[PDB]
């Protein structure tokens with residue numbers, strides 16, 4: 001049969017990454033020609049990230065560790081143009097490498113909640129040696145890690161357990177929220193994504209607004225929307241990996257001042273689950289099927305999607 005899945009959630013919550021996983025898990029994964037297409041995206045994400053860290057150092061008044069980096073930073077901008085076209089010269093690679101290793105660069109990297117930085121920055125920057133290689137071809141994980149804002153409506157098709165899925169993805173930034181209603185017809189289930197690690201961040205499109213509060217407002221409106229009464233609500237509390245590392249050092253009280261639990265994964269995670277599940281105004285009549293995920297982890301997504309499928313089949 002025909003199963004219509006709609007991916008919803010604020011910006012950078014992991015929706016497009018789940019879409020990519022369906023291809024890796026239910027199809028062949030990305031072909032060589034397809035991976036080479038993402039080469040420019042990986043290079044562009046890497047360059048953007050190091051530049052965002054360097055922009056930040058000036059704004060925050062953080063000095064380089066070794067004075068010599070000033071020359072590397074200057075050379076960065078000179079050579080950056082190539083990376084956008086899909087080229088990574090040894091010279092530019094070396095420049096980014098030394099900058100990334102610098103103590104002040106790292107100090108600023110560790111204050112990223114104070115500015116805007118891609119989640120994949122470290123992933124690409126720590127793997128710079130591999131991605132800068134001659135004839136580099138993006139791996140499945142590199143593809144999964146890429147970031148490109150979704151404007152418009154993306155539709156994907158795949159067969160799974162005898163069902164023909166038609167998955168829809170739309171942009172979550174505020175400018176894109178208006179396009180959501182175009183997707184509202186015949187939805188079998190909604191997979192609402194939430195970036196767990198967004199609790200200490202603020203909106204790219206607004207400094208005054210905490211990203212998790214924004215996500216709760218969206219969920220509240222989607223979960224309780226009459227149009228969606230007979231649609232299954234599946235909640236993916238995503239980026240559980242980043243959340244696991246982040247909860248150790250950044251207080252959850254930044255997001256929920258009344259949080260009284262410890263700075264540990266299990267306690268904090270269940271607290272957030274309840275915060276969202278409690279927005280359901282009809283607990284007795286409507287169920288929310290919550291799952292903790294790491295969208296970039298194929299094994300995790302596979303087992304979770306498999307469980308999600310059976311729930312769609314049964315209920």
Ligand SMILES: Nc1nc2c(ncn2[C@@H]2O[C@H](COP(=O)(O)OP(=O)(O)OP(O)(O)=S)[C@@H](O)[C@H]2O)c(=O)[nH]1
Pocket residue numbers: 009010011012013014015016017018118119120144145146147148149150151170171172173193238239240241242293294295296297
């Ligand atoms: N480490 C980590 N990063 C993740 C996870 N799921 C998604 N990402 C990353 O976060 C970035 C944003 O995810 P993406 O899938 O683009 O979000 P989106 O909801 O589609 O964002 P938009 O199109 O509305 S602006 C990407 O670099 C992607 O790799 C996860 O669980 N762990």
Ligand SMILES: [Mg+2]
Pocket residue numbers: 015016017148149150169170171
């Ligand atoms: Mg997207």
